[PDB]
């Protein structure tokens, strides 16, 4: 595994935020795009885009680390990363642009590895990452989502995050009023 | 929470919330948002994204 | 007992999303004017 | 309109009562049976099975009263009645018992009335009588139903209830546990 | 509220829950309840009802 | 802020019983045995 290369496009999402158990998110058209090539060693890493110049490039960025996370839930290794990306999903602004950055380098990870693990698998890391399925969920199931957060282990807490697809209508539009 | 610009599109029949955290407000609908309140907006500073709902993840191989 | 103003509406939102787009106002519709108790 | 009768079958009802503002209800296979027939006049007034013995019989009853205020939305009038009830659901058990009374009285005087009234009048309407519309969508409607009250009036409050079916997989099934 | 029927049958897998005001407890399934459930409840004056999702008001003129 | 014990999970009902019956416990489970904040 040298020279190995995947592309990974990652929805972002919304979702209403309330004091229900039971959240709903929904995946929208606006993209990051990571590409992640397998180099002879090292670490680097680009971002375009939303961050560009922002974010320190190297092993510190959210994708990185959800690469490497993803690489160890595949039971992988490589011998080092070449990281870039594209980001057109505005940052901070409450269009779910972290938990795309974590569910694109899970996603990656797998990809790299020949696709060893399941959906509910990538939603439960990645949601990890934020501690919350919200964003995440819906990034990797695409369309809208419910999920939730059971507290089920032994062990105890351990967070078990659930998500179930739901299919939207075709005519069902988004319009996001995004404040500078 | 509770941002002005959902309110003043709720008060005129428009499915709009905060979104996540905020500070976007975002409309649902089955017919666009006329461009008068698109472009009102616009002058106030805000970015507007008319969206469709999106697949999942997609990863390919090069 | 308790009262509140802030209710959770995904349940409208899922038959809005699925069904009904004519819902998606109420399926928003996270504060009420009248108290819920 | 003397000797038109007719025959309503009402389903019971089940709803997980919670914290939330939407309920669901979901309309269960036991039935109260109302026959109504267009007598001469006066009111005749009989109840068998469930609250048999039970209950007056008169225009004190909920059905008749049900099937009082149908006649007046149908806006319509009969010169008397002859109502017998048939009951299989069980009584003050969470089984919609009243609920379903309610729906097949407005439903009855809709039949004689030759069915002017809308679905959501009929809802309405019967939810009115317990105040919410938990249980009456749901033997309106049949299948599993998700209702709310909206406090939107001018001329508040005016509850007006609303409810809307979803479509439960065949193979689902209800068992209920009656303490006697 | 809670039930005692309730909680037995969930910590045995059923989704149980109090229809209503109860006393009454509701299970959902796609299997039917094992006899020795149900016989054990009726024993102690429970009556067992297995039912199905029903239809919407019929109305029939005579 | 508040926690609490019982919730609500219409939500989940509605999914489990329009296409998931396995999620039929899930939404049912109206009582945590961890408060929700």
Redesign the interface.
Same mark, same amino acid.
Request: aromatic share 8%; proline share 4%.
């Given at each position: 595994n040298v020279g190995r290369k995947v592309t990974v496009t990652v929805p972002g999402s919304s979702a209403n935020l309330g004091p229900g158990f039971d959240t709903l998110g929904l995946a929208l058209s606006v993209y990051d795009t990571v590409e992640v090539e397998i180099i002879p060693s090292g670490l680097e890493v680009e971002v375009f885009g939303e961050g560009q110049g922002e974010v320190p490039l190297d092993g510190s960025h959210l994708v990185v680390k959800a690469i490497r996370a993803g690489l160890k839930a595949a039971d992988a290794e490589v011998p080092g990363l070449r990281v870039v990306c594209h980001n057109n999903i505005p940052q901070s602004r409450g269009l779910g642009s972290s938990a795309a950055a974590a569910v694109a380098g899970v996603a990656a990870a797998n990809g790299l590895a020949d696709f060893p693990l399941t959906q509910e698998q990538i939603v439960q890391l990645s949601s990890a990452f934020e501690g919350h399925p919200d964003n995440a969920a819906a990034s990797v199931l695409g369309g809208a989502v419910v999920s939730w957060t059971n507290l089920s282990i032994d062990g105890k807490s351990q967070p078990q995050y659930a998500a179930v697809p739901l299919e939207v209508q075709d005519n069902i539009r988004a319009t996001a009023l995004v404040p500078n | 929470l509770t941002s002005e610009w959902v309110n003043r599109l709720r008060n005129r029949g428009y499915a709009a919330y905060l979104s996540g955290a905020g500070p976007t407000a975002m409309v649902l609908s089955t017919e666009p948002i006329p461009d008068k309140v698109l472009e009102d907006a616009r002058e106030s500073g805000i970015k507007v994204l008319e969206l469709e709902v999106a697949g999942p993840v997609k990863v390919e191989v090069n | 007992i308790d009262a #509140?103003f802030? /209710?959770? #509406? /995904?349940? /409208?939102?899922? /038959?809005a +999303?699925?069904? #009904?787009?004519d +819902? +998606?106002?109420?399926?928003?519709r996270? #504060?009420?004017?009248?108290p819920?108790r």
């Open positions: - | - | #509140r802030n /209710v959770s #509406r /995904v349940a /409208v939102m899922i /038959v +999303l699925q069904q #009904r787009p +819902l +998606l106002w109420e399926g928003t996270d #504060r009420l004017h009248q819920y």
